[PDB]
Paper text:
The eukaryotic RNA exosome is a conserved and versatile ribonuclease complex involved in many RNA quality-control and turnover pathways in both nuclear and cytoplasmic compartments. Proteomic studies of human exosome complexes recently showed that the 9-subunit barrel associates with two distinct yRrp44 orthologues, hDIS3 and hDIS3L, to form nucleoplasmic and cytoplasmic hEXO-10 complexes, respectively. Here, we report a mechanistic comparison of the human and yeast nuclear exosomes with the aim to understand the extent of their evolutionary conservation and to identify species-specific features.
We engineered a catalytically inactive mutant of human hDIS3 (hDIS3cat Asp146Asn, Asp487Asn) analogous to the previously characterized yRrp44 mutant (yRrp44cat Asp171Asn, Asp551Asn [Bonneau et al., 2009]). Upon 2D classification and initial 3D classification, we observed two distinct particle populations that were then subjected separately to another round of 3D classification. From the larger particle population we obtained the structure of human hEXO-10cat-hMPP6 at 3.80 Å resolution and from a smaller one we obtained the structure of hEXO-14cat at 6.25 Å resolution. The human hEXO-10cat-hMPP6 cryo-EM structure revealed unambiguous density for the hEXO-9 barrel and for the hDIS3 ribonuclease. In the cryo-EM structure, hCSL4 is only partially ordered. Similarly to the yeast exosome structure, the corresponding CR3 motif of hDIS3 forms a long β-hairpin wedged between hRRP41-hRRP42. However, the CR3 motif of hDIS3 is twenty-residue shorter and lacks a yRrp41-interacting loop (corresponding to yRrp44 residues 60–67). In hDIS3, the CSD lobe is separated from the S1 lobe by a large funnel-like cleft, reminiscent of OB fold arrangement present in RNase II and DIS3L2. In the cryo-EM structure, the overall position of the hDIS3 exoribonuclease region on hEXO-9 does not resemble the closed conformation with which yeast yRrp44 binds RNAs entering from the long channel path but rather the open conformation with which yeast Rrp44 binds RNA in the direct access path. When inspecting the reconstructed 3D volume for un-modeled density features, we could observe a tube of density corresponding to a long single-stranded RNA bound in the channel path of hEXO-10. The long RNA channel path in the human exosome is thus formed by the combination of an open conformation of hDIS3 and an apical entry to the exoribonuclease active site.
Author numbering:
A (entry chain B): 6 to 244
B (entry chain H): 1 to 15, 19 to 115, 125 to 145
C (entry chain A): 2 to 288
D (entry chain C): 12 to 275
E (entry chain E): 4 to 290
F (entry chain D): 25 to 234
G (entry chain G): 81 to 90, 99 to 257
H (entry chain F): 4 to 71, 91 to 266
Amino acid sequence: LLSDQGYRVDGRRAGELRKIQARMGVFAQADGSAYIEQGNTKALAVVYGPHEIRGSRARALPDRALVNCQYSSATFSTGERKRRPHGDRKSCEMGLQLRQTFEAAILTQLHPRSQIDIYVQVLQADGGTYAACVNAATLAVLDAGIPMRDFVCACSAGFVDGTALADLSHVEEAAGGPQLALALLPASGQIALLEMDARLHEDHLERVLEAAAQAARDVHTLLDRVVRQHVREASILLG
Amino acid sequence: MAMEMRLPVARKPLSGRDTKKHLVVPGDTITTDTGFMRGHGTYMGEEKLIASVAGSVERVNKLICVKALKTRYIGEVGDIVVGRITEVQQKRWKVETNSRLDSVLLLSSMNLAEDELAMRGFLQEGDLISAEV
Amino acid sequence: KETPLSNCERRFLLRAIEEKKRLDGRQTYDYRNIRISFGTDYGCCIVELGKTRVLGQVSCELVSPKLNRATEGILFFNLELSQMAAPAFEPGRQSDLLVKLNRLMERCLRNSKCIDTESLCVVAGEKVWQIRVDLHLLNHDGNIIDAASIAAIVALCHFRRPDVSVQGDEVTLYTPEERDPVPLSIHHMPICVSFAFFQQGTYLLVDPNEREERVMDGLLVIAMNKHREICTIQSSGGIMLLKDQVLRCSKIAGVKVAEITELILKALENDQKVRKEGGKFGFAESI
Amino acid sequence: EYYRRFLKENCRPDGRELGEFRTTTVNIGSISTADGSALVKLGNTTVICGVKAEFAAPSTDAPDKGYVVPNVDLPPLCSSRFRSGPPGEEAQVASQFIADVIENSQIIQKEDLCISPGKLVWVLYCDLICLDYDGNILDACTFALLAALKNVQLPEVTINEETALAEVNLKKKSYLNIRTHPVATSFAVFDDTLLIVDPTGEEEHLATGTLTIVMDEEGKLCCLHKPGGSGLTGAKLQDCMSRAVTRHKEVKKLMDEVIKSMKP
Amino acid sequence: VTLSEAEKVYIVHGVQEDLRVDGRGCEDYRCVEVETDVVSNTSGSARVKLGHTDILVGVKAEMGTPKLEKPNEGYLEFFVDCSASATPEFEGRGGDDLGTEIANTLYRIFNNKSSVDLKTLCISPREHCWVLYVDVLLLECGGNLFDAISIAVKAALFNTRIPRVRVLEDEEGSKDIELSDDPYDCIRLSVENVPCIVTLCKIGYRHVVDATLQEEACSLASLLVSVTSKGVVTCMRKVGKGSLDPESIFEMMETGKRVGKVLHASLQSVVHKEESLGPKRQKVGFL
Amino acid sequence: GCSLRHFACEQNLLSRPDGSASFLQGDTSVLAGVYGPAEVKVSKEIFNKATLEVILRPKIGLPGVAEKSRERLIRNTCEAVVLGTLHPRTSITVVLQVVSDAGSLLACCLNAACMALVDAGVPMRALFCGVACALDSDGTLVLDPTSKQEKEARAVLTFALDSVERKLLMSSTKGLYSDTELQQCLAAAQAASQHVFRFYRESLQRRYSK
Amino acid sequence: TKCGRLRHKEVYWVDSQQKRYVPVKGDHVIGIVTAKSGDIFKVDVGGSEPASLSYLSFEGATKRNRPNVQVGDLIYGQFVVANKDMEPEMVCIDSCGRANGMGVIGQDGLLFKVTLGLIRKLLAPDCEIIQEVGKLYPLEIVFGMNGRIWVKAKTIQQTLILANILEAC
Amino acid sequence: DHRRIRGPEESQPPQLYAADEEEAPGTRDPTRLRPVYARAGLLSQAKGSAYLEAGGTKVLCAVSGPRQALRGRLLCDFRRAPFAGRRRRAPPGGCEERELALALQEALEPAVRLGRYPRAQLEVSALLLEDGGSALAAALTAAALALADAGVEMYDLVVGCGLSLAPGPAPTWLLDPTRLEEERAAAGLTVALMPVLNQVAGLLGSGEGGLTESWAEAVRLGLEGCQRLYPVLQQSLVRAARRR
Amino acid sequence: EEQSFLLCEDLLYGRMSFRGFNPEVEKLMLQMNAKHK
Amino acid sequence: VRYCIPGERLCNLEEGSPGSGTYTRHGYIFSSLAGCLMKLPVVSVVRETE
Amino acid sequence: VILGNNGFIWIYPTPEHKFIANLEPVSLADREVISRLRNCIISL
């Protein structure tokens, strides 16, 4: 049982999100640090900013910056203990898609011979891991002041019983089967990244994609408040 | 010899701001009056000035820019700077500050072949120097 | 150590894209002429997508099952880039493209529920079939995704496993001399179609080859079905695209999966009619 | 040096002439904690072979056969050409050589290793650490393998009342039986059909081709291992056989004398 | 390479006259922050915050074979992920080096058989016992790395709640296990014999408790002493490149047991203040 | 009466490599692709001779220890026959992918490697080919055994021979044979090498028709 | 040392359809600029090691006048030193000291790669395809002895048909 | 995993299935050393080598030479032989070997002066053939003698001895135990000091139970033991130098 | 003793054009032809 | 002739000067290599090969 | 004190002489004033 009489397992309808709270500037030792939580999924993101290349100096590109992303899950995430060394295949992909989304809109043009590292550590996974990681990395980058095209927000969506669902939990990704996560920058409506692993029929596709994008826009209407609230309580202390 | 532990205190908002500084986040639109030049910390999109880093805005008679709150050090002409030496290359030293690249210090600026092997002696790898830009 | 592309190569090829003309002479919506060949033994296939050869092999054993899943069989995939395929494919250097192909193939042909896992269980908790498929990239001149998906589906269709008989607790297998090996249970045939996006989504292309991948900036993969169900999609290359584009892309991908499913069925029928009358390898349609 | 620098002398620069199978010594049962141990020193090439025994489950295809696993490891303890970490190419080639020598010669019947056919069976781990690598690692490896499997003692085991029982110090140790005696001789080939016996490091390294013959008592050839080419004709192989018989006789005399010395 | 030698000689002359760079004495900790039960997917969780350095420890429960050496009671397992969150110096492979070493030390700290009562962890002997998976995930390394890990693992083992399971077994296979309801679960560990690590890093003639990054980098050698509550001293280690003269070992050993008494009593008081205060209250804050 | 089974040989299948040789021997099948003279890393810089790498991969499972020993045998046979002093500080990579395993892999592998080194254009002093004999319990030898003849027999010998004077280049062994059996298998291998070396020349004339 | 058909002229020589080019002294080779390092800049040939060029080797260049060479532009020239001992070096000037059409080719012309046997067939004085191609319509092409063909026509379709007819035999 | 010949899946040692009660070895003098047989320069292809034997404990060490402020870095690798001890370890190992390697590296750098080796490295390789007793201390002593015969500059040799505590009602420290005396043991300690400069170079010892006085007595007894043990190593290295 | 191939048999020209398509090209081709003849 | 180990002292600063392969502590010159010594003299300890 | 225009602040005791490394030990009151400035800068 997933959705009957319009109500889900968590007790929320098909359109609304989870409760997500993002905090900026955790680790003052680093450059940019963000901690976000979407329901019970905890995500932590650290970016060390545009520092020069320390070793292996042949990697540097002459025109644009280089973006390095590494995804590491905690060993105590789910019930079964999993080991991040010798379990690299799932992670290698999750890092390379982050590399794609943050070479998409980070403006590498302004930083020649520059390395930007984005490290994301997940502390407690409860479904929708990828969207939480992308949102944490976006808040972390906008801490450190790397100038980018647009605020980046990601979410997920499923399709059960003729209705689209937004922001799945672990239960709904477990039994259901249709997952579709996307990363979106809302100033131009351009979908930055798609992920979908399903048996979904073609005639429904557009519908769930709209709902997915709609959920992403709701994320953009929430985190923005946090960012503005944060930057407002910067300026009162300055001038 | 005494040690102390405490529960971690939750941060308080602590409020009167009294500030009219105009504030932008990346993605929104700067108000366009015709006769602006350009700015750093922003870009051109769809023939519209779009800010690119969260912070406040600054307006000069021709210049409109966005001032952030936490950046690394940007190269400015007349500034004095402190730096840490990292490597000893052949004609120059590599100096690390909190800039986006490690700064370079040529040997021709340092007031003291005869220079090449003796270069290592009077300026050790890992000390702290102060200089103008 | 690979040879770099000229500036004039880039300029001339983009100017060729701006008037909707490829290099070889086909249109924008044309796959290259494909060829399916089979090996001697069961489950060995060679797919030519057109100067691009992919070898496919299916092996199968009896392994004790995973503890959480006691009543179905395990699928285990390995797509390994051979050294002969490209001069820059030294072992350990190309980890990124390796993971990006491997996980896409694994997600498609596992989470699509393409071939049955529940038909494999012999004794619950003790003995279960375990299917390992291996795809080798032999020649690199185009989509490794499309040719790999074609080779994996053809190898899953052509493979036969030896019979086991269960009587009480006795599990008695037989040699391929003693019993005919039964074919494997397949629900449907999902397949991958690759789309190339050029200069921020203005120009849509199908099936880029080597130069056509070096000049492009966007790649998209759509996996579809005979019954026009979409299995998996994945974007790569760091591009930004509107949803109208993927909505028009699903239709063309449906037409293409229909045609290639026709080709695979002709391939299997022609190979079986060859092996009914003396035994050989059965070529297959190259159109 | 040079190929002419080794060829114009046309006499071994150690001082040994030709067909001088150099000085070999063994120590028997030196390492007490293992079940079987052998130390072989031949021309300052030093190889220790150790044998551990452990109970395990046999395969479904071989329900009553017994496993034997050799592993020749080459640490950087011996020479500077070997690097730390995973084993190099030379160790893998030598390990597969010891493996197919054990497989082809049948120095031990697998069937004699059974305890209960189907449930428990012996596993003999034969680990070979080279100590000082100069030349002809294959000869010292297989000869240390023979001496170590001569030192193998196993205790009596019996499964009774759903319990496997072993009585180690209860005077139930017995010698493992051997069927044959395979001995390898390896030759180094220079291009002018001057073939030499038992090369050293510079001696093998400037030489082109390498040959290896493993022989039983009766004249049975275990394996003829020759990578490297440089041309060869069968009469030269007949000469190889005729010398390897004599080296087999000599090393059997030596191993028999050392075992008769360490009889008590 | 991390700091100059003139500032080294300034730091050592500050050390010899009881005023370091922050103004602490010879034998004074800075403020230590201990937070109970952060991660809500574990059996036990702790967060520990010292200045710059941050250590979070999660403890889970699992079932498994006890062992063959010690058959009738259970054991502990440690894994330290020196993550890429702390420095870019250890990013892909350098973290598993240092993250090895810390883990090894913890085994020695728990190689007592009198450390934690392992006879509590037995379900039924030779068949099923509990395995405490303790995982240490440090967020940011800021100096004096071994103290906060020990404080964190003590707090996390205090928060550890293990569910009460009794196994019924029959003459058949019968793996049916109860997992009784009402999560009351009074299998809380007796932590009063679990030791804590104190470093005593030596800078000049005087030895200094709780060096920072500068104060470690100016120092030659260091002594690593693990002290229990009462007077019990488990393993000692010399860590460092430099040498160490013999009477300094005895002086640092006495100072270590003194600091150990102070730490242990204060930690017990603070964590009892946590559980005395509103387990439904306090609104646990990681911001 | 000793004769091989049916040979088939194809050149220039693949586009990207410098040479391509498919070799079908009975039911078994080996495809070989060879890169020509190309760039080396600095660690393998040999000023006299050319580095010659051999990679061998079977189709089931990942490659292991025995395959490493086989590819060392390939590298030593090839560097014995490849005139490698002519091209210093360059690397030649020889890649082998097992298509069909029907018995006697090393013979078909050496034949494919020889044809691939010919068609890629690397200068060599001589051709080389591989054959195999199988000694049963009685002593009747069979040239180029099948998997069932390889399984039943007590000895399997694989010989790589040379084209100038039919000398022995490489030899591998799974068996317990005697020396006179070795001599007879070597003579039968020389006759089989004569047949295969004629088959080389026929296919090399079959290419150059245009 | 190779397979081939033996031919003689009064010298004995064999030819083989092979793809990889070996560096031979004094051949006309299209190369690709890799990067520049000070006075010299390196060029990919398609051989064992990349060759070198000096900017003063082009026609009419000194320190006062840099020749316009950009990273990633094809260059037509010939090797002056090419042996087994050192890395090869090429020039873009004749022996007398002038450029006979050497230097930068330019842009807007399709480059592709063929077998050396096709070039040794087409650049005979007795040829067939080149006269028909010149008879049908206007175009201009550049051959390069490492196996490389550059083409240009007025329109793109004729350029593609030219490329297919050249490479398809 | 696939670079070595695989065999059975899971194997068990016979001693756990062995049904016998092994007696304790009894009572001895506390300062009863084992006889020491050491010789240096045994190997040929290594630059320096040493072989150390004490009762049932055997260890061998060899040093690869120097290869290409700036400071030398000796990285040391410690492998145990796979047939040393009752149970057979995996040939990579991976858990305990890196733990002993850090003890080796943190005990050898006070010995080897590294200002005389710019931009170079030293490879100290120790191999433990028979785990008869004090395993870490014999490895330290043999590595010190091998580095000394190898010809790198030092300040002093490194002499190390291990200790152990019998778990009786009166805890009495034992010096240089055998393997059975470690199997019966509760807590074991290991020290190493340079005897001329009279400074401790590294101490590593796991505990089971003790008090601060007892650890102090064990440390000073180990110092007495190493100072006592030194001259045999001296005369052995003198004879090894006289062979040169 | 020389591996050349231009001064073995016979080559053609340098930068051969066609259909007076280009310009300076025709003259260069003519010069090459003159050298050949 | 005598051979010397690194730990043992050689002489005082008044009797000699540290020249090569040794080091200097307070009031003492200690050798630093394993080999033979040679020698206001300049004393130094070397090994026979280098 | 040197207040760099980047993010560095350097604190050093004042010299009366008004380069060479004066490695003499600084007196205690001067050190405690130096360390009082540092903590205030951290707090700010």
